[PDB]
Design a binder for this molecule. Structure first.
Ligand SMILES: *[C@@H]1O[C@H](CO)[C@@H](O)[C@H](O)[C@H]1NC(C)=O
Ligand SMILES: *[C@@H]1O[C@H](CO)[C@@H](O)[C@H](O)[C@H]1NC(C)=O
Lengths: 48, 50
């Protein structure tokens, strides 16, 4: 069972993590049923 | 979820992933109606010593 908990927070700090409290609400409970041991996030390029 | 209690209109605001609410004894004291999404307190029926 793949659980997604999410929270969006308006911040204005430049570099590091803000210091504060914000509880993450569950967003999507996802029925995959597969083995996961390694992950990788996706970025986007800018071309000019 | 079966039970017996007085149903009253509730001021609690459930998050959309929440269906019911539990008290100290883990009995459902607040519930969301599954047809019209509104919250109801469930106060128990009166108990007395005769
Ligand atoms: C999940 O994958 C890892 C690495 O491939 C492996 O060591 C492990 O035994 C796997 N677990 C299951 C339940 O297949
Ligand atoms: C049926 O239930 C949904 C919630 O699942 C609700 O949004 C809708 O208003 C209900 N319709 C009727 C006719 O009760």
């Amino acid at each position: 069972y793949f659980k997604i908990y999410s929270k969006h927070t308006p911040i204005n700090l430049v570099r590091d993590l803000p210091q504060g409290f914000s509880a993450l609400e569950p967003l999507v409970d996802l029925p995959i049923g597969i083995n996961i041991t390694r992950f990788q996030t996706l970025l986007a390029l800018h071309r000019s | 979820l079966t039970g017996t209690g007085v149903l009253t209109e509730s001021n609690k605001k459930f998050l959309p992933f929440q269906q019911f609410g539990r008290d100290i004894a883990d009995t459902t004291d607040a519930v969301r109606d599954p047809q019209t999404l509104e919250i109801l307190d469930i106060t128990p029926c009166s108990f007395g010593g005769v």
